[PDB]
Write a protein that binds this ligand. Structure first.
Ligand SMILES: Cc1cc2nc3c(=O)[nH]c(=O)nc-3n(C[C@H](O)[C@H](O)[C@H](O)COP(=O)(O)O)c2cc1C
Ligand SMILES: Cc1cc2nc3c(=O)[nH]c(=O)nc-3n(C[C@H](O)[C@H](O)[C@H](O)COP(=O)(O)O)c2cc1C
Ligand SMILES: Cc1cc2nc3c(=O)[nH]c(=O)nc-3n(C[C@H](O)[C@H](O)[C@H](O)COP(=O)(O)O)c2cc1C
Ligand SMILES: Cc1cc2nc3c(=O)[nH]c(=O)nc-3n(C[C@H](O)[C@H](O)[C@H](O)COP(=O)(O)O)c2cc1C
Ligand SMILES: Cc1cc2nc3c(=O)[nH]c(=O)nc-3n(C[C@H](O)[C@H](O)[C@H](O)COP(=O)(O)O)c2cc1C
Lengths: 318, 316, 311, 318, 311
């Protein structure tokens, strides 16, 4: 159903935008460097990816096409909520993807609200079964409100905070509505491995949720609520000046990814746009991502940056 | 192919603009002067042009129509990359024949200094009988085109073998020169600079259009410094070097704004491409009309010449 | 690539239409019957389908989703050109379901009597369908020779399994139907213009856009094709396909002289999402075809014949 | 719900039209008559109405506003399905409208499919309770199909045919999808008092029905099925050359009513367009209808017709 | 100026169309032939062209680009009014190519037998074409006297080289064809409405805009002109021109009764870019005309006749 909606409905934001359009990249006609010298290699969560890119979390045959491409290109990949795996270890055969992705970095996904019913061990089991290199918890009160699902988000930050110091790197992310600066403050003390701001502008899960319930978005404005990806990057970075940040949420082009990095991001993550190419097969997914990085490179090149790092600051507000 | 695209495709910028629309000219109803007294005469690169205008660089029969008009009106003209001439001296069939007096800036493009030197340059300005030489930088274009993508140490390779017999200038091809780009040139003894900013023709678009018959990465091709921003930024860094505003400065009124923001010369390329295909008379008509309005604009502004235009504009 | 284009490009016809819009169904407010009494059961190619519907030919994991649904609902299914199978040697999910193997006429120039039997064999198909498509092949720039294919079939015809001829969306004219009148075919698929234009799909694959629009709109509108072909082959069972995307349209198709409806492209996306989605699509289509036949006053696909008028 | 949909949804036909636009009225600049001499008086179902107009059937406080206006202007009125009254005689107090409409002609409404569960007496009781001057049965297989209600319309024409010869005049009508010529044939033998073709072009009850189920019309083409009001008039008249016919189904203006009459109708009936003015009160309803007849008169006047009858034939196909 | 207008103004017809859209080509999915066997070779005015195509008359450097392409592909070419040549006295690039000299009827009022021979002479043309255009001349406000021009030609006719009459885009009516039925012409160019409207081109030159739109839409649609003229001159070779801008349209043109297609304005811009560009344009046009004839079931421009129906 949710997969159906993302593929057939108007689930993207209609009024709010990532805000990246409000910034222009500083073009250096005389930055004097060679395109061949711009290196996208970037180490993330204890592994060296060939580009600062992560396939976004998506929730069976799609995962094998996504992963296969992740390996082929050398980029990371966040798995869909393995929440269903801790409930049916028999269903493990379908998230089994290491087979196609031997080396590729794989972030397992679970979602904070679950720490209210799962603990220390269960977690280890999940990262285990999947043979993941890390684990990501996603928070999403607005989505859950509109969906009318577990609507209780009390004391989840501490329940994590305590049982934290885990064997594998851990990161927190939203699902497209964004993480505010105060949200970043609430995480500043936990020893996280990284953060995914996943802001507004791309796919609105409040819309995806309503579309699943009515076959149309009945409360448009309610579903546009969120922190634009651009604002989220700036705000979160502002609070966590050193933790590696992932910009996701409508960062659908290489040029935009460059802007994302310039504003303070370290990694880019794309989800919905890969959903269709994933249905067509790994080759198609690899093609999509390949082209995205091909332009991210050219963008960094025109900016005068030799790598995702030197992009920082190379942008100005329109 | 490139000539085809500029003539048949959507090669102009779609979202980014020159930004000149963000400024209004300060109309002086009582500046108390006569239209007849506004003089466009302006000396550039060691020659006195009748108007602060340069026909933009364009790359065979078109050049003879452009030049012929350049003479007729007394404006300059930048030649297309004569890069092909240093490779096939036979095919040097030259426009001086139609343009005896007219100021002609030869064109070559920086990335070439990686394979050509001191002499070769002199030969080019020579063969053409040009009054100067212009090197153009364009990493973004070359990236999208997928051509020579190496721009390392080109500024110095020029810097050293610089002090040349003829005046030299650096220009972009429509994506613009940033203030830092102007900084990287501040030390070289250049004769002038052409900021050639975004807003007019996007060569990234022209390039993609040549490869797919359509622009596949629109946003990627809109990357650049708007002509208005480039004028302000570059002037800011090189307060005295003569500057050429080009890149979507398609009307006289816009040229006036360009000057007001800190430019000394205006340059137009693509818009002249079609009239050039129709003949010199048509090209002369176009440019004539442009200057006719530039004059009226300077007149309404209260400026007697391209110089007094400086500052006579405000941000909307 | 072709699968990519159908899923991402403007491959549907832009100017020519099926023409079904030119006809209105004769609504009988007092036909006096019960919706429950309208039966879609229809026997085709030696099997009894639960509705006069066939999943259109489409060319790997999609086929298993399409077939699984074909079984679930009791409708037929045409397989993609098994041409690739005779060069590099789904029943598992579809035990009972009627399956028409597909090959394409131009191949009889390089394959014969046996090879055919082998194909229907390997697939465990209930019949075999040859598709003709000169316009597509022209634009594609593929095998462009269609000489003597009708006879090469005509002779080696009388085959162990029922055989049918079809186009790929540009339609079969009345003269085309004449050229087939003598062959002992099991059925025909007019596959007319109005839905997906394979000339467009073909050009889109070559330029990422349709460069010769008008050239790709060439064809016989599905409505015209039904009328024309029926006119020539008054009894051979006919399949209406080519932009017959709704139940209401299917009803019109039948009313004009069709016996079966076939849908292709519209099922391509639901096929990528899985059998449940495909079954949902088709289920809904038949749900409306039934209501349409109901309002028309027809108790079955047959009584629909003639229950329509030109607007 | 149904009342909600007609008031808030796109329940009118989207592609099919009444078809009246395909005819132009024959304007007689020199028909040489006085506007004052065109008389709308027309006797229907044993009563003399002041204009060939009937308020369409609509299904509580609205009925009192509609009726009150019916009296005020001297036009008829068809009541909503009193089907609910034969099931809850206690609910009679709400259809009780004779109090406001002492004289006005009132056609009770019931709907054919009910003769499968009600008989001779029950009918008399309904016309009785309401103190109606006649009874109208409505057929609507397409609506019922889409609604998913009683979908069995077998032998309803005869069940009526036999127990017919009733104490009060009886008429058959559709609900907006129209009656075909064959439909008219199936009625040619029954001794009906009149017929309401109620064709397509105005409100599509298939759309109203789907809108109630999904909050949107999911099968547009399916809901456009029907006989355009113009076609229905011609076709039915063709079969029943003398039975008085009512043209309804998108005949929303006086000028259109004139066209309706010209094509062979005797009475015009309007429903949905009166629904909102009915919610505002009798005065508003009277205003609407008053204005409609004011233009019908002018139209008949320009046509050269002194009354609804002389309108017959005064129109041509564009 | 006129060259400027055609290149920069809205000189095409705005309301009237060629009318070719009113016909659909009869697609023969089973015409059973090979694309390779459709031959465009067609002999015209005493020469064998490789395709039934003629570059339209256009009026200096453009002509060398057009001609050079004419040779390259093997198609004909009509020269601009050489009227200016008989007042102030391209084969070099086009040695073999068929070249129709152009002059225009209204000139026979001031030029005679010899002068004509001189023109065809100087140009080394293979024939001569006179163009009539009262509507253009009216709007232009030029020589507006067209009296007795048909006879002045009629008499001094029987000329050493083949002669043909044409309009300039407003078309030749059936009666116009009647007035020519007696003269021994080599061929006719109906040059109908639907493409470039010279009344518009003319007004655009005078006001920089079309002030009397409806006045400039006056004319016989190319489709009607083909039918009407053919009707009167069942055997004289006919050229369809006037908005016949695509191969598919050319096919329709032929099907309705034309023998040759001629394109003008659409070649004007590629002509400004050079012969290669012009050749590309025409090459692509014939490439589709071939495919169209192929789908129609026609082996050559002749078998196309009648292979079309009215929509
Ligand atoms: C089909 C689909 C499934 C998803 N499943 C998950 C999931 O299981 N867990 C999660 O944390 N996010 C999930 N997401 C969210 C993305 O990882 C993330 O919210 C992103 O911001 C939305 O993609 P973006 O805007 O490019 O489109 C899913 C998104 C899509 C489209
Ligand atoms: C047909 C055409 C050919 C050109 N050729 C050259 C060239 O050889 N070298 C160069 O440095 N710029 C060339 N240019 C670029 C212009 O000189 C310059 O980039 C300008 O900013 C684009 O024109 P503008 O925006 O008015 O249109 C060419 C532009 C056009 C339209
Ligand atoms: C992805 C796709 C694959 C197809 N593959 C074949 C094929 O292998 N053989 C064939 O004869 N037709 C094939 N078709 C054509 C259809 O069977 C048929 O031409 C139909 O008329 C097009 O579907 P329709 O108009 O509903 O959409 C294919 C169509 C689609 C969309
Ligand atoms: C709120 C509403 C309630 C209705 N109730 C009935 C009803 O009970 N019985 C009936 O036979 N028709 C009913 N109708 C139908 C009308 O009498 C008739 O179908 C008409 O053709 C629709 O109105 P028209 O097209 O102007 O809008 C109802 C229509 C509306 C808008
Ligand atoms: C630039 C241009 C110049 C032309 N010059 C002539 C001419 O000298 N004599 C003539 O008879 N027709 C001339 N024509 C007309 C064409 O030969 C003919 O009228 C044709 O129908 C218009 O081209 P078509 O509709 O494809 O565009 C000219 C057309 C154009 C566009």
């Amino acid at each position: 159903k949710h997969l159906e909606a993302c593929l057939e409905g108007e689930v993207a934001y209609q009024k709010t935008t990532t805000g990246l359009e409000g910034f222009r990249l500083r073009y250096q006609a005389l930055a004097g460097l060679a395109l061949s010298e711009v290196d996208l290699t970037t180490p993330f969560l204890g592994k060296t990816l060939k580009a600062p890119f992560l396939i976004g979390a998506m929730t069976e045959r799609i995962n094998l096409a996504l992963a296969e491409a992740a390996e082929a290109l050398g980029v990371g990949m966040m798995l869909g909520s393995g929440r269903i795996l801790l409930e049916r270890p028999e269903a493990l055969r379908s998230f089994r993807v290491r087979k196609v992705a031997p080396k590729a970095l794989l972030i397992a996904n679970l979602g904070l609200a679950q720490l209210r019913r799962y603990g220390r061990d269960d977690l280890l089991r999940l990262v285990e079964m999947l043979e993941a290199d890390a684990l990501a918890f996603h928070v999403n009160p607005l989505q859950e409100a509109v969906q009318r699902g577990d609507t209780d988000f009390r004391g989840l930050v501490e329940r994590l905070a305590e049982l934290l110091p885990l064997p594998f790197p851990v990161m927190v992310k939203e699902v497209g509505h964004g993480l505010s600066r105060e949200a970043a403050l609430a995480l500043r003390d936990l020893p996280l491995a990284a953060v995914d701001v996943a802001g507004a502008g791309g796919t609105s899960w409040a819309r995806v949720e309503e579309w699943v319930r009515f076959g149309e978005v009945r409360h448009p404005e309610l579903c546009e609520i969120g922190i634009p990806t651009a604002r989220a990057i700036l705000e979160v970075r502002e609070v966590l000046p050193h933790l590696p940040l992932v910009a996701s949420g409508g960062v659908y082009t290489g040029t935009d990814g460059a802007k994302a990095l310039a504003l303070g991001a370290d990694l880019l993550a794309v989800a919905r746009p890969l959903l269709r190419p994933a249905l067509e097969g790994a080759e198609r997914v690899a093609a999509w991502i390949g082209d995205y990085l091909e332009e991210l490179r050219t963008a960094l090149f025109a900016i005068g940056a030799r790598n995702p790092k030197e992009a920082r600051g190379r942008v100005e507000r329109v």
